[PDB]
Coordinates of all heavy atoms in Angstrom, one line a residue:
Chain C
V119 N 19.4 -12.1 -45.3 CA 18.2 -11.5 -45.9 C 18.0 -12.2 -47.3 O 19.0 -12.5 -48.0 CB 18.4 -10.0 -46.1 CG1 17.2 -9.4 -46.7 CG2 18.7 -9.3 -44.8
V120 N 16.8 -12.4 -47.7 CA 16.4 -13.0 -48.9 C 15.1 -12.4 -49.6 O 14.4 -11.7 -48.9 CB 16.2 -14.6 -48.8 CG1 17.5 -15.3 -48.6 CG2 15.2 -14.9 -47.6
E121 N 14.9 -12.8 -50.8 CA 13.6 -12.5 -51.5 C 12.6 -13.5 -51.1 O 12.6 -13.9 -49.9 CB 13.9 -12.4 -53.0 CG 14.2 -13.8 -53.7 CD 14.4 -13.7 -55.2 OE1 14.9 -12.6 -55.7 OE2 14.0 -14.6 -55.9
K122 N 11.6 -13.8 -51.9 CA 10.6 -14.8 -51.6 C 11.1 -16.1 -51.0 O 11.9 -16.8 -51.7 CB 9.7 -15.1 -52.9 CG 8.5 -16.0 -52.6 CD 7.4 -15.2 -51.8 CE 6.1 -16.0 -51.8 NZ 5.1 -15.3 -51.0
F123 N 10.7 -16.5 -49.8 CA 11.0 -17.7 -49.2 C 9.8 -18.4 -48.7 O 9.1 -18.0 -47.8 CB 11.9 -17.4 -47.9 CG 12.6 -18.6 -47.3 CD1 13.9 -19.0 -47.6 CD2 11.9 -19.4 -46.4 CE1 14.5 -20.1 -47.1 CE2 12.5 -20.5 -45.8 CZ 13.8 -20.8 -46.2
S124 N 9.5 -19.5 -49.4 CA 8.2 -20.3 -49.2 C 8.3 -21.7 -49.8 O 8.7 -21.9 -50.9 CB 7.0 -19.6 -49.8 OG 7.2 -19.3 -51.2
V125 N 7.9 -22.7 -49.0 CA 7.9 -24.1 -49.4 C 6.7 -24.4 -50.3 O 5.7 -23.7 -50.2 CB 7.9 -25.1 -48.2 CG1 6.5 -25.1 -47.5 CG2 8.3 -26.5 -48.6
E126 N 6.8 -25.4 -51.2 CA 5.8 -25.7 -52.2 C 4.5 -26.1 -51.6 O 3.5 -25.5 -51.8 CB 6.3 -26.8 -53.2 CG 7.3 -26.3 -54.2 CD 6.7 -25.3 -55.2 OE1 5.7 -25.7 -55.9 OE2 7.2 -24.2 -55.4
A127 N 4.5 -27.2 -50.9 CA 3.4 -27.8 -50.2 C 3.7 -27.9 -48.7 O 4.8 -27.9 -48.3 CB 3.0 -29.2 -50.8
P128 N 2.6 -28.1 -47.8 CA 2.9 -28.2 -46.4 C 3.5 -29.5 -46.0 O 2.9 -30.4 -45.5 CB 1.5 -28.0 -45.7 CG 0.6 -27.6 -46.9 CD 1.2 -28.1 -48.1
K129 N 4.8 -29.6 -46.2 CA 5.6 -30.8 -45.9 C 7.0 -30.4 -45.3 O 7.7 -29.5 -45.8 CB 5.8 -31.6 -47.2 CG 4.6 -32.4 -47.6 CD 4.1 -33.4 -46.5 CE 3.3 -34.5 -47.1 NZ 4.1 -35.7 -47.5
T130 N 7.4 -31.1 -44.3 CA 8.7 -30.9 -43.6 C 9.9 -31.4 -44.5 O 10.9 -30.8 -44.5 CB 8.8 -31.7 -42.3 OG1 8.7 -33.1 -42.5 CG2 7.7 -31.2 -41.3
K131 N 9.7 -32.5 -45.2 CA 10.7 -33.1 -46.0 C 11.3 -32.2 -47.1 O 12.5 -32.2 -47.4 CB 10.1 -34.4 -46.7 CG 11.1 -35.2 -47.4 CD 10.5 -36.5 -48.0 CE 11.4 -37.2 -49.0 NZ 10.7 -38.3 -49.8
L132 N 10.4 -31.3 -47.6 CA 10.9 -30.3 -48.6 C 11.7 -29.2 -48.0 O 12.8 -28.8 -48.5 CB 9.7 -29.7 -49.4 CG 8.8 -30.7 -50.2 CD1 7.6 -30.0 -50.7 CD2 9.6 -31.3 -51.3
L133 N 11.2 -28.6 -46.9 CA 11.9 -27.6 -46.1 C 13.2 -28.1 -45.6 O 14.2 -27.3 -45.6 CB 11.0 -27.2 -44.9 CG 11.5 -26.0 -44.0 CD1 11.7 -24.7 -44.8 CD2 10.6 -25.8 -42.8
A134 N 13.3 -29.3 -45.1 CA 14.5 -29.9 -44.6 C 15.6 -30.1 -45.8 O 16.7 -29.8 -45.6 CB 14.3 -31.3 -44.0
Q135 N 15.1 -30.5 -46.9 CA 15.9 -30.6 -48.1 C 16.4 -29.3 -48.7 O 17.5 -29.2 -49.1 CB 15.2 -31.4 -49.2 CG 15.3 -32.9 -49.0 CD 14.6 -33.7 -50.1 OE1 14.3 -33.2 -51.2 NE2 14.3 -35.0 -49.9
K136 N 15.5 -28.3 -48.7 CA 15.9 -27.0 -49.2 C 16.8 -26.1 -48.4 O 17.6 -25.3 -48.9 CB 14.6 -26.1 -49.6 CG 14.1 -25.1 -48.6 CD 12.9 -24.3 -49.2 CE 12.8 -22.9 -48.6 NZ 11.7 -22.2 -49.2
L137 N 16.9 -26.4 -47.1 CA 17.9 -25.8 -46.2 C 19.3 -26.3 -46.4 O 20.3 -25.6 -46.1 CB 17.5 -25.9 -44.7 CG 16.3 -25.1 -44.3 CD1 15.6 -25.8 -43.1 CD2 16.6 -23.7 -43.9
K138 N 19.4 -27.5 -46.9 CA 20.7 -28.1 -47.3 C 21.4 -27.4 -48.4 O 22.6 -27.3 -48.5 CB 20.6 -29.6 -47.6 CG 20.2 -30.5 -46.4 CD 21.3 -30.7 -45.4 CE 22.0 -32.0 -45.6 NZ 22.7 -32.1 -46.9
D139 N 20.6 -26.9 -49.4 CA 21.1 -26.1 -50.5 C 21.5 -24.7 -50.0 O 22.5 -24.1 -50.4 CB 20.0 -25.9 -51.6 CG 19.7 -27.2 -52.2 OD1 19.6 -28.3 -51.5 OD2 19.5 -27.3 -53.5
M140 N 20.7 -24.1 -49.0 CA 20.9 -22.8 -48.4 C 22.1 -22.9 -47.4 O 22.6 -21.8 -47.0 CB 19.7 -22.3 -47.8 CG 19.2 -20.9 -48.3 SD 20.4 -19.6 -47.8 CE 19.7 -18.2 -48.8
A141 N 22.5 -24.1 -46.9 CA 23.6 -24.3 -46.0 C 23.3 -23.7 -44.6 O 24.0 -22.9 -44.1 CB 24.9 -23.7 -46.5
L142 N 22.2 -24.2 -44.1 CA 21.6 -23.8 -42.8 C 21.2 -25.0 -41.9 O 21.2 -26.2 -42.4 CB 20.4 -22.9 -43.0 CG 20.7 -21.6 -43.8 CD1 19.3 -21.0 -44.1 CD2 21.6 -20.6 -43.0

Side-chain angles (χ1 to χ4, degrees):
Chain C
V119 182
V120 287
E121 67 178 36
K122 188 68 170 179
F123 190 96
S124 57
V125 73
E126 282 294 306
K129 285 299 202 92
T130 60
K131 191 177 169 190
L132 299 172
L133 183 63
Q135 281 180 17
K136 98 178 206 175
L137 293 152
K138 296 284 264 65
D139 297 41
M140 236 293 170
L142 302 168

